[PDB]
N, CA, C and O atoms as a DFTB+ gen file, in Angstrom:
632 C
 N C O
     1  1      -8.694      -0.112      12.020
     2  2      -7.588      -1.114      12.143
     3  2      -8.181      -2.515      12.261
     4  3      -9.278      -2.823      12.727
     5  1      -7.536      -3.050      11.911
     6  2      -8.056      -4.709      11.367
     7  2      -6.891      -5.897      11.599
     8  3      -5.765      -5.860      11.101
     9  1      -7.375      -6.879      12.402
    10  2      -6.257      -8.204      12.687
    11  2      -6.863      -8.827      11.319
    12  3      -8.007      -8.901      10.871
    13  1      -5.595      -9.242      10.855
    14  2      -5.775     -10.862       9.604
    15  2      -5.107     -12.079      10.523
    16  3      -5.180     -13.247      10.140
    17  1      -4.620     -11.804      11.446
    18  2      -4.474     -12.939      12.256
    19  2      -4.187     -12.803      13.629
    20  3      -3.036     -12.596      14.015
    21  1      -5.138     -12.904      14.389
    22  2      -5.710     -12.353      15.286
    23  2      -4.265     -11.409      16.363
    24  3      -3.509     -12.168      16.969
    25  1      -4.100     -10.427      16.456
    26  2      -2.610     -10.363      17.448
    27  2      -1.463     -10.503      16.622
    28  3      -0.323     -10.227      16.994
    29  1      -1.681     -10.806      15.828
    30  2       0.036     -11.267      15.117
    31  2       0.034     -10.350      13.819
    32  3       1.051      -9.801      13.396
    33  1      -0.930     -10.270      13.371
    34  2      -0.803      -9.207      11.486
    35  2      -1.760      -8.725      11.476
    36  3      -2.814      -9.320      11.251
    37  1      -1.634      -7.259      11.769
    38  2      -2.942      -6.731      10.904
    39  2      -2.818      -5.608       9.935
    40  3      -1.687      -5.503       9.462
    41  1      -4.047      -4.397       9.357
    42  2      -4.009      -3.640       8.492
    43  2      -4.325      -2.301       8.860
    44  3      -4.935      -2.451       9.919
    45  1      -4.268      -0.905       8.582
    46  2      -4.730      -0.039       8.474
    47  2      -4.131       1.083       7.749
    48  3      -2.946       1.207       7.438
    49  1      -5.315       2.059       7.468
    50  2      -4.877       3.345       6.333
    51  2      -4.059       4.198       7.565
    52  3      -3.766       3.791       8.690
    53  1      -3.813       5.447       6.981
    54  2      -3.025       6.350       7.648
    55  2      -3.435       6.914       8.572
    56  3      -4.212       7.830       8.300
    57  1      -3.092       6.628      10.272
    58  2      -3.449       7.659      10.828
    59  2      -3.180       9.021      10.929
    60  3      -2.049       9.508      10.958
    61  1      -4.630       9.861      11.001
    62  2      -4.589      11.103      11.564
    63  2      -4.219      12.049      12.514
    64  3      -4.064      13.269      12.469
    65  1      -4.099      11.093      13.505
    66  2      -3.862      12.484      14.990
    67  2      -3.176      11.014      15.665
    68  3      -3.336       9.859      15.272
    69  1      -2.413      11.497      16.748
    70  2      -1.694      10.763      17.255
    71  2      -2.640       9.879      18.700
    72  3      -2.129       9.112      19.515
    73  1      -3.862      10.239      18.642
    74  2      -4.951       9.271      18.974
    75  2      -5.100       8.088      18.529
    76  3      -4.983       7.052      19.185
    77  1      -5.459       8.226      17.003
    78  2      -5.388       6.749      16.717
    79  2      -3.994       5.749      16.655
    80  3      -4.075       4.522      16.703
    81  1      -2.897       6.388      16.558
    82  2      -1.830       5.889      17.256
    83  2      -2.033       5.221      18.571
    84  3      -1.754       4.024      18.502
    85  1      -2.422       5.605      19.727
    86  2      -2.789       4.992      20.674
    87  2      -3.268       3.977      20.848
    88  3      -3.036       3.026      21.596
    89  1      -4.153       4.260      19.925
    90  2      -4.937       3.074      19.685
    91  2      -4.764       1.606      19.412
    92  3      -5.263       0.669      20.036
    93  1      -3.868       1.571      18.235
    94  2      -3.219       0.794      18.135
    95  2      -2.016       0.234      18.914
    96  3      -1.412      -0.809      18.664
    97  1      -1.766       1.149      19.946
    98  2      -0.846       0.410      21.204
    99  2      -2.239      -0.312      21.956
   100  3      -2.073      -1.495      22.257
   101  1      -2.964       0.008      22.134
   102  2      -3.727      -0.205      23.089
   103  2      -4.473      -1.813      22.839
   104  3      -4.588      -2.684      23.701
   105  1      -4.888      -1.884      21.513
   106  2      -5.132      -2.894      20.484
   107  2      -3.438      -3.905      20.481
   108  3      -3.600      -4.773      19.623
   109  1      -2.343      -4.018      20.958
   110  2      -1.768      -5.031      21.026
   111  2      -0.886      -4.774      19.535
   112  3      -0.374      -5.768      19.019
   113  1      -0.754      -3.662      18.982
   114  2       0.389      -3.429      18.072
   115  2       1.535      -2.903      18.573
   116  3       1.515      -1.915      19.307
   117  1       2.758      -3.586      18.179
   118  2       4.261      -3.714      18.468
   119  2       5.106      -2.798      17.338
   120  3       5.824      -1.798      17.320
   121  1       4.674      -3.576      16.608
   122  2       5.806      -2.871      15.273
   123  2       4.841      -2.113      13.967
   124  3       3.741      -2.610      13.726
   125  1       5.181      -1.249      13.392
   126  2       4.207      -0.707      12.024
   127  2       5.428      -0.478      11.042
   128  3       6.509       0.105      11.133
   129  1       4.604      -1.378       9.817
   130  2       5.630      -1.380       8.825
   131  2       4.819       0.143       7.894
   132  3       3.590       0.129       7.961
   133  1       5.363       1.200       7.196
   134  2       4.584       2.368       6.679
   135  2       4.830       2.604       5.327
   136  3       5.748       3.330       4.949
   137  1       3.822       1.853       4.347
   138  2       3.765       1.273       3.287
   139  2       3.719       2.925       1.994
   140  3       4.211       2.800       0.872
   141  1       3.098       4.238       2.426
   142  2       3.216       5.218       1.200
   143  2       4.549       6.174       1.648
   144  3       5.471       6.180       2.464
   145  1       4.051       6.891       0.650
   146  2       5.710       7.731       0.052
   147  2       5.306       9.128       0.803
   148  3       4.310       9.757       1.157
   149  1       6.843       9.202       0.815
   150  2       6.848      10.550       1.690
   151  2       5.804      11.455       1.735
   152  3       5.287      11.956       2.733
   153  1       5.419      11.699       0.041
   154  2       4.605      13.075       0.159
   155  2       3.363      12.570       1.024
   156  3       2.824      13.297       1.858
   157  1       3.027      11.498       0.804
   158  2       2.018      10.865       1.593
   159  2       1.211      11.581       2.669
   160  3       0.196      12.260       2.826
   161  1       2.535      10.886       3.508
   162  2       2.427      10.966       5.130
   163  2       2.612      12.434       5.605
   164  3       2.337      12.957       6.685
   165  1       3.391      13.151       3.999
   166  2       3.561      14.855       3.978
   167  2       2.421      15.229       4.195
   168  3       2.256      16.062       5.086
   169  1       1.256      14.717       3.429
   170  2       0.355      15.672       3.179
   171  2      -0.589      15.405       4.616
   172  3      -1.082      16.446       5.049
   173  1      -0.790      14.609       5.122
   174  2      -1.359      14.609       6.605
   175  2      -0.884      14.988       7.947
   176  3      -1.477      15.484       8.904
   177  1       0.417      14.603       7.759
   178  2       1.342      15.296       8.848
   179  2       2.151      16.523       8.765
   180  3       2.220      17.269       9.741
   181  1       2.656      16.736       7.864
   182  2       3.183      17.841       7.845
   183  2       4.648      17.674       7.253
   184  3       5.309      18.511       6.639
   185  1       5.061      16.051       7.685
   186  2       6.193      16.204       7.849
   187  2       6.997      14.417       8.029
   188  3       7.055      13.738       9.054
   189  1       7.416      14.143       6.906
   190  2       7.438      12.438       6.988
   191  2       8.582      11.746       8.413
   192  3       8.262      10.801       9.134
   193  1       9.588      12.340       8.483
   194  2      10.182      11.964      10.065
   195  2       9.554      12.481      10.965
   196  3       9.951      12.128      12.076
   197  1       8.554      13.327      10.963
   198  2       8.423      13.696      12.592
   199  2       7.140      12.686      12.464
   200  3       6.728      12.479      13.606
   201  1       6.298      11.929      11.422
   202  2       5.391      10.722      12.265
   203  2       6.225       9.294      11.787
   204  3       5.668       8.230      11.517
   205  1       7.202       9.464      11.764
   206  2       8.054       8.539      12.078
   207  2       8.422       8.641      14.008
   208  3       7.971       7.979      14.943
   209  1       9.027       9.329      13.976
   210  2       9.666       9.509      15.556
   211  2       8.185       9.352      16.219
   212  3       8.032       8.570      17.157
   213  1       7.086      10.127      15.699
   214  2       6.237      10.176      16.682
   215  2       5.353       8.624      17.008
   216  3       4.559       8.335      17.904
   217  1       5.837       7.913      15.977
   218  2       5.771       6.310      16.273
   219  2       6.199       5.913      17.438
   220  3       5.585       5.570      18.448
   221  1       7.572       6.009      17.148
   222  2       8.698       5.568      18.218
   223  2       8.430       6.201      19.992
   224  3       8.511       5.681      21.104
   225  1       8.100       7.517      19.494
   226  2       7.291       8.069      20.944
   227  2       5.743       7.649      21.255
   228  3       5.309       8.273      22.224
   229  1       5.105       7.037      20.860
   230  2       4.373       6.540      21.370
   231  2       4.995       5.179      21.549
   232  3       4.159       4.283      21.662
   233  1       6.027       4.871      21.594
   234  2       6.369       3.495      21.909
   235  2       6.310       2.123      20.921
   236  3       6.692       1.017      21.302
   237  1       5.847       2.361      19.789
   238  2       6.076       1.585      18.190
   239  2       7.175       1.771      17.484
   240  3       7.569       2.873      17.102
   241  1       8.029       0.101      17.160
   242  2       8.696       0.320      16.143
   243  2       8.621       0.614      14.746
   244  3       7.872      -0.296      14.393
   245  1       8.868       1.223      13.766
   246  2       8.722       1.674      12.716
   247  2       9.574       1.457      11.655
   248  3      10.754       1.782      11.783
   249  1       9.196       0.986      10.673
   250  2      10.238       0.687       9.742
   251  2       9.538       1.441       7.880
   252  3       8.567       0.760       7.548
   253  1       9.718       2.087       7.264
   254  2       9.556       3.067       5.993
   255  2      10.066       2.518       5.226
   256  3      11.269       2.623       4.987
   257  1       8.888       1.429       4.355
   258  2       8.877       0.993       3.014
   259  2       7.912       1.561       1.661
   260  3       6.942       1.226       0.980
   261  1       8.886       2.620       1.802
   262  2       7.707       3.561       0.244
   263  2       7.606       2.597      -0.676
   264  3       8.448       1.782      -1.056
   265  1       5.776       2.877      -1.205
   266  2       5.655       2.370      -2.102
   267  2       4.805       2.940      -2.696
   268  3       3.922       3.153      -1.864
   269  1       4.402       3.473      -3.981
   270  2       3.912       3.710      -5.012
   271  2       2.045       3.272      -4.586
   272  3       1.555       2.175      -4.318
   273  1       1.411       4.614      -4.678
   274  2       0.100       4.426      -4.502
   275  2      -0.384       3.289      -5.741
   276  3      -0.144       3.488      -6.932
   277  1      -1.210       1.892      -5.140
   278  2      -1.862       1.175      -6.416
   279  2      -0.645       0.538      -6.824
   280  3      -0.688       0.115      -7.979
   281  1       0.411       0.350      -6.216
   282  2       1.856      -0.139      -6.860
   283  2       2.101      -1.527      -6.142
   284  3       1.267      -2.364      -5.796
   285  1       3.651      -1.540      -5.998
   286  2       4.089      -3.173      -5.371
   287  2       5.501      -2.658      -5.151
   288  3       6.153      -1.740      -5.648
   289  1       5.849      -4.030      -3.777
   290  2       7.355      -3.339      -3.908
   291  2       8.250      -4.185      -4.750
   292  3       7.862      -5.196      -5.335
   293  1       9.477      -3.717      -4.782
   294  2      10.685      -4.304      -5.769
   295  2      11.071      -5.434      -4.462
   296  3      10.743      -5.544      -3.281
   297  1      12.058      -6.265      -5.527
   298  2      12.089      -7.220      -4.797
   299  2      12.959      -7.275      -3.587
   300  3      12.982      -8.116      -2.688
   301  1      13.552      -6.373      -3.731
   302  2      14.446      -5.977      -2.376
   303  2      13.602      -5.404      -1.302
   304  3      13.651      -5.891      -0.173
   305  1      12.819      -4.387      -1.582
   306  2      11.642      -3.866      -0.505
   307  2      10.334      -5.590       0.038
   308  3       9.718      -5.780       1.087
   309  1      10.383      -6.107      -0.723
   310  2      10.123      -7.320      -0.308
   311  2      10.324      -8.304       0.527
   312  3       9.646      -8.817       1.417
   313  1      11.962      -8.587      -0.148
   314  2      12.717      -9.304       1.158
   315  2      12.936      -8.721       2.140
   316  3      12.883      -9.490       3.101
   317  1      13.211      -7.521       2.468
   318  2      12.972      -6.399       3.643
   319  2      11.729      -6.851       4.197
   320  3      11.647      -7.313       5.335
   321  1      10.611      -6.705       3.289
   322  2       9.471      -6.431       4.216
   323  2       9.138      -7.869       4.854
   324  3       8.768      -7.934       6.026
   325  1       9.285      -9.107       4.001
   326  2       8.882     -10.497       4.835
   327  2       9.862     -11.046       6.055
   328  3       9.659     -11.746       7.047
   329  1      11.239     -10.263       5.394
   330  2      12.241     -10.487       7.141
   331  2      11.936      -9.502       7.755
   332  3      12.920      -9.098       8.375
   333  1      10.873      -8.752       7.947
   334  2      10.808      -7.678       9.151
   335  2       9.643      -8.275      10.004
   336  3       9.697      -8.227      11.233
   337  1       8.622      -8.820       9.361
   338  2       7.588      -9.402       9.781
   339  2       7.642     -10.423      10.232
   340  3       6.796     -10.971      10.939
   341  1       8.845     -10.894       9.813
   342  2       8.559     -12.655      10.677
   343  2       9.702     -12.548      11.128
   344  3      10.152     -13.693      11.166
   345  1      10.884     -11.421      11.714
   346  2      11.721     -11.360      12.947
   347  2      11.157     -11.083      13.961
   348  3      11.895     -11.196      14.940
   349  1      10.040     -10.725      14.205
   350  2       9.006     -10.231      15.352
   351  2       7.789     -10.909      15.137
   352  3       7.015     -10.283      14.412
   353  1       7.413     -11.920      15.516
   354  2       5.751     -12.498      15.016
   355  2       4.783     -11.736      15.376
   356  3       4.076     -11.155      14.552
   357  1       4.565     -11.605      17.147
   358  2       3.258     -10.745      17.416
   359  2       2.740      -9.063      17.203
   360  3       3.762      -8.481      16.839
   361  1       2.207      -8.593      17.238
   362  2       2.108      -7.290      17.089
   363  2       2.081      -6.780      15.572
   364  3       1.850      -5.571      15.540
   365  1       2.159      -7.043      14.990
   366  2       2.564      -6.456      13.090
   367  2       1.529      -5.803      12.568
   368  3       0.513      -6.348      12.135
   369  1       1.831      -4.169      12.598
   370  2       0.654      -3.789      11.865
   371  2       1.068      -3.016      10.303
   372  3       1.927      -2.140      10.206
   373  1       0.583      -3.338       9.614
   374  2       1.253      -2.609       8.141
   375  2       0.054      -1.781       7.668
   376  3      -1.142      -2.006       7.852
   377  1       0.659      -0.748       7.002
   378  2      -0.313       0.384       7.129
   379  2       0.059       0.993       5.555
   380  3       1.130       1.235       4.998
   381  1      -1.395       1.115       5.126
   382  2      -0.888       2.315       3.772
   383  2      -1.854       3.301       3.535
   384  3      -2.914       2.853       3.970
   385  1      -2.031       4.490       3.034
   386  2      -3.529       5.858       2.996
   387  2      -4.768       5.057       2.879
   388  3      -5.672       5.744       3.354
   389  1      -5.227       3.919       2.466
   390  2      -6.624       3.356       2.936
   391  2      -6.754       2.294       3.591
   392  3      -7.812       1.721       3.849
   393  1      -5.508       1.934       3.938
   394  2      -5.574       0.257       4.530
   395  2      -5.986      -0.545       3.477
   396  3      -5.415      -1.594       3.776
   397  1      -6.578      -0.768       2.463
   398  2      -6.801      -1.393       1.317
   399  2      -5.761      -2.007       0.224
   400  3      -5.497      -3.208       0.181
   401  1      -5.170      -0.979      -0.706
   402  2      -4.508      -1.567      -1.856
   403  2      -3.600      -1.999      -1.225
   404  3      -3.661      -3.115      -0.709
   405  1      -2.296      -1.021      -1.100
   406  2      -0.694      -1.848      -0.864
   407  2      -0.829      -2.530       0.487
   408  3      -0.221      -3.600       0.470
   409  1      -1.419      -2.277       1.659
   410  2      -1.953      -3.021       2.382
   411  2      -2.380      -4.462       2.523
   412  3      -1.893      -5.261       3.323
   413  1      -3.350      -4.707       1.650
   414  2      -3.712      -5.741       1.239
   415  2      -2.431      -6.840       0.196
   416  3      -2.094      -7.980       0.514
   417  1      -2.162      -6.422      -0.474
   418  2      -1.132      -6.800      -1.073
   419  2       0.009      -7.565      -0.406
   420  3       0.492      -8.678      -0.614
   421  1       0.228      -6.762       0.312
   422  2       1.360      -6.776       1.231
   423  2       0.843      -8.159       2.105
   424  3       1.316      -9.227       1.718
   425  1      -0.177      -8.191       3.354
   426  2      -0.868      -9.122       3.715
   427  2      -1.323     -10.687       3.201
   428  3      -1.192     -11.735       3.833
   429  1      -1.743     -10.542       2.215
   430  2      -2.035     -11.521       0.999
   431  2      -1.153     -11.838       0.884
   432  3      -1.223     -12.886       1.525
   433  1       0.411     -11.756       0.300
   434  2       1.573     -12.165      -0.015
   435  2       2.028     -13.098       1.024
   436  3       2.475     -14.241       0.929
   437  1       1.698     -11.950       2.561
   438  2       2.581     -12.436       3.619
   439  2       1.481     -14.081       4.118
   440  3       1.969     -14.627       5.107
   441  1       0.340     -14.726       3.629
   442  2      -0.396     -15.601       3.730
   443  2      -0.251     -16.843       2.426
   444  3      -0.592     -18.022       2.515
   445  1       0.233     -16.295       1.486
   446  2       0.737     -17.118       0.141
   447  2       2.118     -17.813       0.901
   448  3       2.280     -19.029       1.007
   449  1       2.935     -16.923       1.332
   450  2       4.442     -17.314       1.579
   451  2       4.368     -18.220       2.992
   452  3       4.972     -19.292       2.954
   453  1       3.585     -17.824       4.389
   454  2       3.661     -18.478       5.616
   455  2       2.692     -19.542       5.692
   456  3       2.882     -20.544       6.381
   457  1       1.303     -19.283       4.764
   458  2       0.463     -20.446       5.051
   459  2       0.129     -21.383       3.822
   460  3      -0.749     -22.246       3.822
   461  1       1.121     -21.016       2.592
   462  2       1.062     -22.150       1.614
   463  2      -0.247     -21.305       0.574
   464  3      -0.322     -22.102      -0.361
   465  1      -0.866     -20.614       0.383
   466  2      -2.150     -20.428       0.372
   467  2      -1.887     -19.878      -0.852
   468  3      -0.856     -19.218      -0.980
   469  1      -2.961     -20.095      -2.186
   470  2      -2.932     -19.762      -3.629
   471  2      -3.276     -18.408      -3.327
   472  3      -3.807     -18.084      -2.265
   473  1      -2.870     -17.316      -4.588
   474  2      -3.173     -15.789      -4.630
   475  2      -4.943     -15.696      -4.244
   476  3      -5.211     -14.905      -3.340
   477  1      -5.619     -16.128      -4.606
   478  2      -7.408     -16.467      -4.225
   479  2      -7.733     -16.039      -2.981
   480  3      -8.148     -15.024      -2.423
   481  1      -7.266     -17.628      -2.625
   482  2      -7.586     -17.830      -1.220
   483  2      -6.810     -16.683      -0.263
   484  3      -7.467     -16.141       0.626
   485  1      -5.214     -16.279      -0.490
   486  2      -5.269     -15.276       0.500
   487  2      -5.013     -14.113       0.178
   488  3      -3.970     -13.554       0.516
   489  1      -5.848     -13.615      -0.466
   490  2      -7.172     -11.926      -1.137
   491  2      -8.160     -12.461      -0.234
   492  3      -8.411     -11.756       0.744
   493  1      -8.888     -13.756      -0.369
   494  2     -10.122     -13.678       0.181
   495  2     -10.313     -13.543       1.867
   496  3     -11.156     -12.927       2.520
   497  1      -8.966     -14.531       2.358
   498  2      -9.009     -14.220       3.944
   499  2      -8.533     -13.142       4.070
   500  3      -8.624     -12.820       5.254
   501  1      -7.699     -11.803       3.030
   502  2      -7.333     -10.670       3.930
   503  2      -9.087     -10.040       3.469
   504  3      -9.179      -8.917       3.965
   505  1     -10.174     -10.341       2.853
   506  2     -10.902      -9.788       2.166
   507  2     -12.149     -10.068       3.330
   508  3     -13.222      -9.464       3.340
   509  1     -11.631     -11.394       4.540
   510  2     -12.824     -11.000       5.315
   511  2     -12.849     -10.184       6.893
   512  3     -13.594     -10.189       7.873
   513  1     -11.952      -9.705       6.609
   514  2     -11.353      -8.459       7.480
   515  2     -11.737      -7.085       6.915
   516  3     -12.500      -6.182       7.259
   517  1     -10.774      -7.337       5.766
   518  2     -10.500      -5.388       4.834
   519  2     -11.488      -5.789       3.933
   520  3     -11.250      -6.972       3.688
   521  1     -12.671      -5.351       3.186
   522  2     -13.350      -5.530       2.315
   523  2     -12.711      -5.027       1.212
   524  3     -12.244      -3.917       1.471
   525  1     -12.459      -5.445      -0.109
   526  2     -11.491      -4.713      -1.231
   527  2     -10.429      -5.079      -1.339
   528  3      -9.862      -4.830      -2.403
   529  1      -9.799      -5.730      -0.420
   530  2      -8.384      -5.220      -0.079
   531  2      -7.381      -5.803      -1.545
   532  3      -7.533      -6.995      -1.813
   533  1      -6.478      -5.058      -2.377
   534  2      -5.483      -5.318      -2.989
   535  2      -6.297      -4.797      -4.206
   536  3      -7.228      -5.417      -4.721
   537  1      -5.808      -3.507      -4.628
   538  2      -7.148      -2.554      -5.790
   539  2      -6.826      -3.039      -7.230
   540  3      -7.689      -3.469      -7.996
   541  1      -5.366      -2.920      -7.560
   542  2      -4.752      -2.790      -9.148
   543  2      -4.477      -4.693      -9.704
   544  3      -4.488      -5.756      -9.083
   545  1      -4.298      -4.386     -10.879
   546  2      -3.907      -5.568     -12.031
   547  2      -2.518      -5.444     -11.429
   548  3      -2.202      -6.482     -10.848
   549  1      -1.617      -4.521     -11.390
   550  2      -0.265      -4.854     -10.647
   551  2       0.031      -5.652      -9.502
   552  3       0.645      -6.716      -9.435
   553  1      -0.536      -4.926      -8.565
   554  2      -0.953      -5.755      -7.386
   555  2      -1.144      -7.296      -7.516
   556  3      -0.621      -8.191      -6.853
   557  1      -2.156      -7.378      -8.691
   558  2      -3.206      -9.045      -8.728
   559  2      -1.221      -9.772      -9.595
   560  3      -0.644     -10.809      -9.267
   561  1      -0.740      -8.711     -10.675
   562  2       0.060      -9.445     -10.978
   563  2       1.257     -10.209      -9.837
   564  3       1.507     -11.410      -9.744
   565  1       1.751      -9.271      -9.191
   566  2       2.788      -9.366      -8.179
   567  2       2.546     -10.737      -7.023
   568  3       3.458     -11.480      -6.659
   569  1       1.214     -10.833      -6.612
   570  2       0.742     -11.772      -5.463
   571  2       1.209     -13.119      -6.581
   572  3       1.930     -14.075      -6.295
   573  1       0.493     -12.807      -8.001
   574  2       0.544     -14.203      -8.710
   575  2       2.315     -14.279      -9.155
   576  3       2.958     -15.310      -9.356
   577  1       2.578     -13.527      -9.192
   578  2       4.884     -14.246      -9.409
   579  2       5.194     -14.179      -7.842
   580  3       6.216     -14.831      -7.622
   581  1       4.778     -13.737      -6.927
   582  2       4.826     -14.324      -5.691
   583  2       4.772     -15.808      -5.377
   584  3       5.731     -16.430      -4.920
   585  1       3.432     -16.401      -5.690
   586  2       2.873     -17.420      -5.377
   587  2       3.756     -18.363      -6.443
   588  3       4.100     -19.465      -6.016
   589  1       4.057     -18.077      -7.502
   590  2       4.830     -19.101      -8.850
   591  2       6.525     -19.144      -7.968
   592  3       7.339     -19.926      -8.459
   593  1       6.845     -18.556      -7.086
   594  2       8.180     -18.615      -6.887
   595  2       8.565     -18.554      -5.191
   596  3       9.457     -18.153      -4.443
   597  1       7.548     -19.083      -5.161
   598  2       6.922     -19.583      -3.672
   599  2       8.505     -19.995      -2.722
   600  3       8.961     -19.140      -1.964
   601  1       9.179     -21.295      -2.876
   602  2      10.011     -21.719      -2.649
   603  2      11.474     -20.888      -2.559
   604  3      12.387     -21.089      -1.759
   605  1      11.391     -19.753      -3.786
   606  2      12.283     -19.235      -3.748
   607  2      12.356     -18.073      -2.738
   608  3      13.334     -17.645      -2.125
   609  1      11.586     -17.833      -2.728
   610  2      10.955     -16.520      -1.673
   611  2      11.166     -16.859      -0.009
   612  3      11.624     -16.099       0.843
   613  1      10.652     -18.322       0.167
   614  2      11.365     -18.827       1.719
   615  2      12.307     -19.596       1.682
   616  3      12.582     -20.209       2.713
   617  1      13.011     -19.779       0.603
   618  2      14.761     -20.048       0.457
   619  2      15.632     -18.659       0.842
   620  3      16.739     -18.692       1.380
   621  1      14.966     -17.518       0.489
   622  2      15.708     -16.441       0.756
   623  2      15.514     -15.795       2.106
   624  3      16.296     -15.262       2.893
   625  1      14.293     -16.004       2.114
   626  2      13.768     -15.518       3.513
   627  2      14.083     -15.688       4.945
   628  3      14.143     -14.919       5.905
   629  1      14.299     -17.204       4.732
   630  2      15.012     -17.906       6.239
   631  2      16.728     -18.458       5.445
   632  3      17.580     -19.012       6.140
């Protein structure tokens, strides 16, 4: 698990056992946004609501934005995801199976839109945290019509 800004946003892949859950309470995470698709979280848990609830029982809010391994979200899973993150500032941890691609993506975007910052520059600050982070040409496309429609994105947002 990884801060991109120190306490307020960070990253990680899927946890395993409800240890590293802890962990991340323990580390100063509030809310987890849970970036893959059902079968996902199927294939490690067993079972995609019960590590949902088992969020909530360890005391994390949780919010389930499937998205497509190596993918991006639509623009509605978008505006979802940047009003979920900035109705709660501290604590934000977004999570996808490596902490890397949609992860990164996701992060990067959320640094284009709050700190002004070209697609480059924020790959490179989520990049000195997550090494890799944001894998596909989709991905690289999405950050860049992000960043071109900048204005429109926190016209809708707030």
């Amino acid at each position: 698990m990884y801060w991109v800004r120190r306490k307020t946003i960070g990253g990680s892949g899927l946890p395993y056992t409800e240890n590293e859950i802890l962990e991340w309470r323990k580390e100063g995470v509030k809310r987890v946004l849970v970036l893959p698709e059902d079968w996902e979280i199927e294939e490690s848990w067993g079972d995609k609501d019960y590590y949902l609830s088992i969020l909530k029982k360890n005391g994390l809010q949780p919010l389930h934005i499937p998205i497509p391994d190596g993918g991006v979200p639509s623009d509605s899973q978008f505006l979802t995801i940047m009003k979920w993150l900035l109705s709660e500032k501290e604590g934000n941890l977004v999570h996808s199976v490596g902490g890397i691609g949609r992860t990164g993506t996701i992060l990067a975007s959320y640094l284009i839109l709050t700190e002004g910052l070209e697609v480059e520059s924020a790959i490179d600050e989520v990049r000195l945290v997550r090494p890799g982070a944001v894998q596909t040409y989709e991905q690289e496309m999405f950050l860049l019509r992000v960043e071109g429609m900048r204005k429109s994105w926190l016209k809708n947002i707030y």
